[PDB]
Amino acid sequence: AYSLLSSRNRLIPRVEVQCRKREWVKTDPDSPFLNGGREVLYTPFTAVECTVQPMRGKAIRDQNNQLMIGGEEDYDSYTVYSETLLFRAREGTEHLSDQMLLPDSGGGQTWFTVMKADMYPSSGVPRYRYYLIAVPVGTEGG
Amino acid sequence: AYSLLSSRNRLIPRVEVQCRKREWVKTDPDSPFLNGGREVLYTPFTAVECTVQPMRGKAIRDQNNQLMIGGEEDYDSYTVYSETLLFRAREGTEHLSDQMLLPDSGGGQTWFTVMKADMYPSSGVPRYRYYLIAVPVGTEGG
Amino acid sequence: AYSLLSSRNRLIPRVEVQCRKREWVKTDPDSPFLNGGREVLYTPFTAVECTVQPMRGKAIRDQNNQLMIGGEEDYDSYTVYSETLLFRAREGTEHLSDQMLLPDSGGGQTWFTVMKADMYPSSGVPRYRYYLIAVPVGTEGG
Amino acid sequence: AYSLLSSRNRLIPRVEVQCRKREWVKTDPDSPFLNGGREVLYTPFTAVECTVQPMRGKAIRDQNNQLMIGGEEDYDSYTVYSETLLFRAREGTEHLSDQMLLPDSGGGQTWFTVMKADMYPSSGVPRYRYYLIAVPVGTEGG
Amino acid sequence: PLDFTNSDVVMGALTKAVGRLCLDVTGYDVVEADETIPKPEGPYILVDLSLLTPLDWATNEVVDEDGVVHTAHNYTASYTLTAYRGKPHWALSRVHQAFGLPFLREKYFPTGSPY
Amino acid sequence: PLDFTNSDVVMGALTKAVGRLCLDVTGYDVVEADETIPKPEGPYILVDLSLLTPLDWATNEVVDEDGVVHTAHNYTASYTLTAYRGKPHWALSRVHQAFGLPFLREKYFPTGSPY
């Protein structure tokens, strides 16, 4: 079985990041809809150690500021290697996708939503790879 | 003839997985259709030793949770190397494609349906490669 | 001139396969058409030694069982290296493309029709590469 | 932690470049619009050391002079490695994307606008990569 | 006690009526779009309920013994037929002409039927 | 004992009627779409039965001796012709004018024929 990869690295620096779980709930008392007035509940936590890297190409959809008919919108993304388990959304449930807070190109800090998670069930070592997309500015995603 | 590849590996860990065969049957007594009320019959079994790996890219159709007009649907897939023979569906028959149970990105376990099987008839060694797609949530595939 | 490649290999196993030539004929006595009631005439033979390999990718058109509006159709293909000469169809003639019998993903055996043949006239050694597509289930091709 | 990359190179020559920050302001007293008569405010500065390189391919959109129905328009771009932090535009604000002055294919000098900025937050060393597009001739961009 | 046949019954029985008449005339085999199966062997026909159109205003009202009201609406259902081998164009045509044969219709489309 | 010629006979004989008149006028060679063969040598014509339209209500009813009923329906079949070499436009035109020549038609479209 794997031995070296089953232990923490000692050459490349790694950092911890903050995250938060997400659910949703219905608030309207009389509306007949599952949506109602949707609300999201958060529960914070942290990842043991992570590595953050940017997109490699220069494709038009990967550029940071984009020109739309309204104005120069904003976009960011990352690829993350981590030893913590993060989950995407699951259907027929009230759980949403986990989010984690990282620096952006504008100098601030914003939340990124997990979109793709990679796992190797037959190997055993707990090492994962994630792909993240920054939440739209002015909202908390979906 | 091949010798080394005709024996089980001794460096990379391998695991066994569970599977199940699938047929179908007509139930309606009076309906004139081959479909009738379709039913599927199962017969379980296991694979001797297997290796599971995820998709390598980040293409939009390979992401786990997808945004549709209804809601954040679910999708998963794998690539599997195995020494057991699994069969796809064959036309003009009552046999369906084999399925096997593997872990998913949401933390649960679900059935994956064999879609592509690779064989090397001229080599002799029984080593195969499969490509699997997770069954739609809430159903048993087709 | 080439020497080593002008002799049979002694490390990689090779197998022989069966084939059959194909012509066509008109049967209707009064129909004014070249087609008439078409018939195909066969003459069997074998290839001296061959190697069979499957398609390398996972493109949607290379998958084995395909979902159509009628039902889960069937598809297979191969790449073959051989030291026998096989011919495709030639226009203005009554000769059709050669076919050869190989195992499929459903566990049976079916006929594959030669579609692309590669030759190196300036080299001299008789080594060829072919690309084959399985005949539609329930018919004898065209 | 990284040591060698945390210091300035001593084999490849590097140069400094000039830049300028950009904001915008409304001038019309009575117009009800956020746009008003837009104006841009500049504040110059310089980058510590930079490397400039051109696009690698020959794709039709990367050629310098382009034929349009009006006349042979002009286009240029670059890829820059630098140890200074430059920012793109941020929404809901009055800040615009930074620009920097570089030589062009026509022998002159023109302003390039930052479009994509790459950062490695988990590594620590302050080394960045930018992608720039020349401002349209006769205007100051947007 | 004043019962009837609601929409669900009529709609489901119309498919089977079409299925039997196609089988009994053309001699081909029949299959629906509702569930997918590996493609059968030999010529066969596929049946699908592509579209359904309503007519706005109800044509009749039947009052139960206790006062409950049952409302009746006219509709038009369109079925898409596809024949897959043999002489498919010949097969479909014989289905068309079948509706002109009196005895054959009476088996599946008796007078007073809801379609 | 009161027999007839069903749809299958008429439909199949119409193709051959078109095939012979094309061969006998233009001098080209003829081929159908039903089965595929390597492309012939020299100019030739391709025949296809692209489309077929029914007419709703039967025009005649013939009662057998024992009471069985035979129903007759009007149709319209459309054939797509394609000429592949030589002067194809000239070849097709001569097919058009052939239907105006009296003696030539009588060979293949005799009075009383079902098409």
Tell me, yes or no, if F34 comes closer than 8 A to chain E by beta carbon.
Answer: no
3-state secondary structure (DSSP) of residue E23 = helix
Flag if C105 and B117 touch (Cβ within 8 Å).
yes
CB E47 within 8 A of CB E30: yes
Nearest-angstrom CA–CA distance, A88 and A96: 7
Q: How many CB atoms lie within 10 A of CB A113?
A: 21
Considering only the beta carbons, identify the residue of D118, D119, D122 that sits closest to A51: D122
Nearest-angstrom CA–CA distance, C93 and C95: 6
Nearest-angstrom CA–CA distance, C104 and D73: 58
Q: Which residues of A touch B108 (CB under 8 A)?
A: 90
Flag if B31 and E41 touch (Cβ within 8 Å).
no
Flag if E84 and C70 touch (Cβ within 8 Å).
yes
Among E95, E43, E47, E87, smallest CA distance to F54 is for E95
Q: Which chains touch A (3 or more CB pairs under 8 A)?
A: B, D
Nearest-angstrom CA–CA distance, A54 and A73: 19
Residues in CB range of B19: below 8 A, 6 or more apart: B44, B45, B46, B47, B84, B86, B98, B99, B100, B101
Tell me the residue type at D123.
Answer: S
Rg, Å, chain A Cα set:
18
Residues in CB range of B32: below 8 A, 6 or more apart: E16, E19, E20, E23, E30
* Token pair 């005709």 in the structure block, residue: B6
Tell me, yes or no, if B53 comes closer than 8 A to chain A by beta carbon.
Answer: yes
User: What's D135's DSSP letter?
Assistant: P
Among F25, F32, F27, F26, smallest CA distance to F46 is for F32
- Experimental technique: cryo-EM
Tell me the residue type at B114.
Answer: V
Resolution (A): 12.7
Considering only the beta carbons, identify the residue of B38, B89, B95 that sits closest to E35: B38
Size of interface A-D (CB pairs under 8 A): 65
Q: Which residues of B touch E39 (CB under 8 A)?
A: 91-92
Nearest-angstrom CA–CA distance, C32 and F29: 9
b/e burial code for range E75-112 (CB count within 10 A of at least 16 → b): eeeeeebebbeeebeebbbbbbbbebbeebeeebeeee
Nearest-angstrom CA–CA distance, D135 and D133: 6
Query: By CA distance, what is A90's nearest residue in B?
Result: B106
Nearest-angstrom CA–CA distance, A119 and A127: 7
Flag if B53 and A122 touch (Cβ within 8 Å).
yes
Nearest-angstrom CA–CA distance, D84 and D79: 14
Residues in CB range of F87: below 8 A, 6 or more apart: none
Q: Which of B6, B116, B123 to probe by mutation at the C interface, max C CB count within 10 Å? A: B116
Considering only the beta carbons, identify the residue of B90, B117, B122 that sits closest to C13: B122
Among E35, E8, E40, E20, smallest CA distance to E95 is for E20
Q: Which residues of A touch B58 (CB under 8 A)?
A: 116, 131
Beta bridge partners of A20: A44, A99
Q: State the first-to-last Cα distance of chain D, in angstroms, to the nearest integer.
A: 40
Phi first, then psi: what are they for D37, rounded to 5°?
A: -85, 95
Q: How many CB atoms lie within 10 A of CB D108?
A: 8
Flag if B30 and E19 touch (Cβ within 8 Å).
no
Q: Which chains touch D (3 or more CB pairs under 8 A)?
A: A
Q: Which residues of E touch B96 (CB under 8 A)?
A: 38
DSSP symbols for chain B: ---GGGS--SSS--EEEEEEEEB-B---SS--SSSSS-B--EEEEEEEEEEEE--SS--GGG-SEEE-SS-EEE--EEEEEESS------TTSSB---EEEEE-TTSSEEEEEEEEEE--TTT----EEEEEEEPPTTS---
Flag if E89 and F54 touch (Cβ within 8 Å).
no
Q: Which chains touch C (3 or more CB pairs under 8 A)?
A: B, E, F
Residues in CB range of E16: below 8 A, 6 or more apart: B30, B31, B32
Nearest-angstrom CA–CA distance, A104 and D88: 10
Look at strands F75-83 and F69-72 and give their pairing: unpaired
Strands (E), A26-142: 42-53, 65-67, 72-74, 77-82, 99-103, 109-118, 128-134
Q: Which residues of B touch A96 (CB under 8 A)?
A: 72
Tell me the residue type at B142.
Answer: G
* Token pair 């081929």 in the structure block, residue: F31
Structure tokens at D49: 């050391």
